[PDB]
Amino acid sequence: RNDRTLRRMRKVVNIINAMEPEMEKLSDEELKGKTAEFRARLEKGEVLENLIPEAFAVVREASKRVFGMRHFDVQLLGGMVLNERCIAEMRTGEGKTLTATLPAYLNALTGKGVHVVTVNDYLAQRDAENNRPLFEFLGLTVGINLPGMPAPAKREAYAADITYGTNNEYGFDYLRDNMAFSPEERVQRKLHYALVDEVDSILIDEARTPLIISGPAEDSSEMYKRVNKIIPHLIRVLIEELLVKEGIMDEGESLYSPANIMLMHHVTAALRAHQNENQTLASITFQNYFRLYEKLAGMTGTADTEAFEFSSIYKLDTVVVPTNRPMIRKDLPDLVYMTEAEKIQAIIEDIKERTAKGQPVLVGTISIEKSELVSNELTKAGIKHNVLNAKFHANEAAIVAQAGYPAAVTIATNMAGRGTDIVLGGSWQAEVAALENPTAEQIEKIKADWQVRHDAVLEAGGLHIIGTERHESRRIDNQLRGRSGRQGDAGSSRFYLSMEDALMRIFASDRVSGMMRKLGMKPGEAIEHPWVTKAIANAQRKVESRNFDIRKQLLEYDDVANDQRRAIYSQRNELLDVSDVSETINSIREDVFKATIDAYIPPQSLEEMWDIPGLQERLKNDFDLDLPIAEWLDKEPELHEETLRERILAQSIEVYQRKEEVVGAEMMRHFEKGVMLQTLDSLWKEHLAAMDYLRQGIHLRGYAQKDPKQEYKRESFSMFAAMLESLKYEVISTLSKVQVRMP
Amino acid sequence: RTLRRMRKVVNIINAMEPEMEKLSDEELKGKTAEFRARLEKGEVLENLIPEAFAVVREASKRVFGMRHFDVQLLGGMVLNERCIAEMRTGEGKTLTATLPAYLNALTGKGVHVVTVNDYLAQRDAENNRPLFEFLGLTVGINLPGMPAPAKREAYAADITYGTNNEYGFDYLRDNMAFSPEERVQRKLHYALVDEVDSILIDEARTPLIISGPNQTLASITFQNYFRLYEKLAGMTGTADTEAFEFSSIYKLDTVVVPTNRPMIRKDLPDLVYMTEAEKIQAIIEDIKERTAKGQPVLVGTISIEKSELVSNELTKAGIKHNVLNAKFHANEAAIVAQAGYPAAVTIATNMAGRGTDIVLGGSWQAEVAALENPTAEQIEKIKADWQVRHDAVLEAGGLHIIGTERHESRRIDNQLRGRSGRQGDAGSSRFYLSMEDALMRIFASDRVSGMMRKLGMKPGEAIEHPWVTKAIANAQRKVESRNFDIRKQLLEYDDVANDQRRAIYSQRNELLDVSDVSETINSIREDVFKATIDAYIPPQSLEEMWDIPGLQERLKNDFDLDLPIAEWLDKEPELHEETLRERILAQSIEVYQRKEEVVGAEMMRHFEKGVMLQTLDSLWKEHLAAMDYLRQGIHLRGYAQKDPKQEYKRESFSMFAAMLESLKYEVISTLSKVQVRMP
């Protein structure tokens, strides 16, 4: 799979490289000209993928000229990966941010937009501004989208060829677009391509995080009095006592009905209770926001392990991109000791032995106390070193700078991801950055000195990483080890574990674990077994896998809400996009008036079988339509069920035409549209609140036994279909009963 | 006087520099032997300050490429006294400190430079080692985990460097030693404390404990650790707020050191608004005007959420800026580097103390930093273009600081503020408050506070009422002083235990320092026998009141001393009380003489010492536990119009007095009951 894709891509790389001379000979204007020229071709029905070699060749040359930098072949590969529904895994230091100029350019050609998704505003802003002169060189515009930005500025940012901004704010824009009353209010365009800069946090860790817009844009207060008023007779089964009372729920209904849920919430708040609240107007999770893009792609580092998750949550394939130089870091067999003490003793040994050959070491621990421990023992053994202490960030940046210096030893606690590159030999710019007026032959010096240090650290084996314990998450171990062997540099790594260590628990048999014990790891000595390393890694994988199972069940609950939100927003946007909702109105009125009479007159039925005590009233009650109708048919005996069905619809229409000559065609059309949006909104927010309740009234509504979800999907899909019909009927009522000072 | 008098000295040192420039390095190394010899012959240390400091300045010029500035000589002088030097950020505290360290190393008693953490202790011992080696002095470094022989060595160096924690710990472990040769520290001579706010104030009352199996075996607070030194001094920022505290906790004076260049930062009057919304609009508008003229702005807020709000509103206003987000370290350092760049706008949440310098115009050093292969005139173009930006930000007013809210502690406000106007640069600051602000609540009255709403403030009609700046500053001053009034009560209690530990460690040390404890043993044997006997034979009473049965058993049970006292008495109608007490002593001794003929004398001497120490350490451990219990019962034991304390002091005193008698007892019961096989 990865092997043959990569082969096929290496072939296209060789095409691109051969085009380099053509792009070189080209003037700056001629280069800017390729864009319109690709677009002309696309307009004539070219396939965008056929453009990859020339477009990449064009972007590569532009970047030589604007940035002074020329995409490496691995970067060309990474770019082609990101044209597909894929994650490019590119090792820290491989140049993700330059890589990303390639797919961003290519996927801008069709004029549909590109969303570059950064983790924070600083990078959005930084990247937009760094790339603006590149992409302007190429006749594209760039937009920057930020929180607080006004809507007209936002509209421009989204109308640029390429956009930068954080995941959050993309989401938030989406929601507010789905709260618009006119389509000119939208800031976004159709969601074309999302290129996510760091997928681990953005797509995975934060997959289920809801984006919520709330607004004290509540409404009602009556209920909390009504429902309170019942409570000063509640005196320490208990469903029935509650049920049978008032002018809400009269008709022998059920309160524990997933339907009366807001009510039940009212009573159970009123009982718990012994200015306006701001409800959710709109929600989406990130995972479901990303799933809306026609095309999705992104980048992460080589630390992987979550390929199975990207695939199942997002259908993102993943391509492991080679590094530009050979990755020669030596990841040695995990070692396993009886006790911590024995473990540390052999850790200190390793460090002793290495720092004496001039090799620098970075010790990653799982806690401060674990740090202080390995530290103090290093001091006991006479080994100089420094701890990165999270309280002294300044000291930490200075430590980190000399951390590749010969025989340097640095201890870090639960170390993060990416982090500052550690330069072997020490950093030599960090050194002239300290020189308040330098020279050519001071510089010469610093650098000569440094090459000698650097070549000696490489020759001593590069940065050695020591993991004093492993994490449950291998991704994290992998990020630790990944700080060594960057850009082809020698380095190595080794993890230590002991039988005393926390992680021993991940095997889930305590005695099955205590069998390595029976290889009693003798004091002086040591062996290495390749199967242990794979056991451990396998176990880390199984914990990850079971965690993701747990999470798949959560995402299934989520798919219920996604499916309902997609459908309803789809309906809302059909309406929004139409200036004239009138024929939709005509059809719903018919739907509503057929069903409404059906529930009183049975189709193709006998006058013997028709009723008014509730009908007659229902029509006056919900429609301000008063047809004292009994007599129509005892005074005009012949017409018939179908010529009358017709006739009531006709009336209703006549009262409506009447109100409209009074108000204005347009004014009316626009009101109806407004009513249909406002009512869909109301219902939907009601619906969301009710689902949230069920969903929590269902971590425990009942039983280890039967199926909680399932029943929940059914209840919830069911209320969504009820809401769909209640929307038709509530819109028609409104239009029927609307007051206007007449003739 | 002290400043104007110190300036005279500085004039002397300045006038000696031609002299010193004429000296070779070896001549300069030589002055240290010369100073010491003068000292041997009776010279007062303070008489050397001119020569010593001028030598240290020349040594620094040659070794560091740095010449101490005049204000730095002043600081170093201050630090020779029992005194806190206040020096503003950027003034070169670290170089300044080399002066008194040098001076106070000269008598050969040692110097402890106290650092907040192990990185700085090593960093500065190594940075300074060649300066001090240039001058014939050695440097020691003390770390946690360091073997005793290496610590012993660090403490034998002329000047030592380490954290407060490790210094204090060493002291307690030294006071758990069973031979004096085990001690790591020398007499506590001079402590130079680097960040006295954290080290001496915030942490004054924090106990350093050693436990074992779990229970406290040794304890001392930081205050009382530093109070052991003969000379104490320290450094902090002029961000003041705690001088009265230093005097009370430590008997340190404080001296504000003048900046090398004049301070010209314009700290404008504080501004009050009705609402948070009105506050932001005034902030936005300040930024707007200031950035349109090229001036950079740093904005400090009191939460993430308030940073956001101020951020979104700037954006809403079309003002580009960057938030410092604690989640993104690398971004933050990148942002900081250029936060002095024209019209830059930067927002920081609960800005934390000193922080990184903001170079006006931008940092150009982080420009050369960014190069792959920087080349001389790649630089000059960088430095020259920078000089233009720097001077344009200076002309524009330097860095403007905006507080969007004040913290209840003014030290925090002052640290935000102090980020501007460093080393003579132009700068300004403004703090914003609203009636909706949490701080309004420090006034402790709704209505008093709420009166100021009557100013009716009104947008683009803000006035400026100076009285309000000072009313605020006084409020923050009252809160501190309140909190310290309480703390002073808590230290009145700490002092009880302090004195008790002084007393008991003194004693213990006296024992430790000697190899023969015989005078004391013989002498406490008498005490113990008297008291034990007194319990059964009330002095000067008739025979009828004596419990000779009770005394017989007691001697057997606690002294393995089995005497037929009833037979003596009965057989010598002769023998009376005094004479009887003497027999009992004599016997105990003869029994002891005999074990000593077996065991050997020097073995016995050392047995007796070890027993005294160990018995002391057990009773003390017990005593600390019970002093703890007694103190936390402090509420309802002392009740209605006595002082609790007075009472606590009384109970404490009694309990300590009883322990010393009870120490005597157990030592002699042990020495009495020790089994030895008679051959």
Ligand SMILES: Nc1ncnc2c1ncn2[C@@H]1O[C@H](COP(=O)(O)OP(=O)(O)OP(=O)(O)O)[C@@H](O)[C@H]1O
């Ligand atoms: N083709 C290239 N030629 C020259 N310099 C490059 C090239 N590609 C990248 N660089 C430089 O290499 C560095 C590597 O890191 P970069 O900011 O791209 O992130 P990375 O480590 O791959 O991942 P991330 O960017 O997400 O932190 C950058 O300094 C970049 O300017």
Ligand SMILES: Nc1ncnc2c1ncn2[C@@H]1O[C@H](COP(=O)(O)OP(=O)(O)OP(=O)(O)O)[C@@H](O)[C@H]1O
């Ligand atoms: N006399 C001098 N000549 C040249 N440079 C000096 C001189 N004195 C101090 N410096 C430099 O001034 C800078 C600020 O000093 P230092 O690190 O002592 O900062 P500080 O804020 O005063 O001390 P601290 O960080 O301990 O609070 C340092 O980079 C230091 O080397």
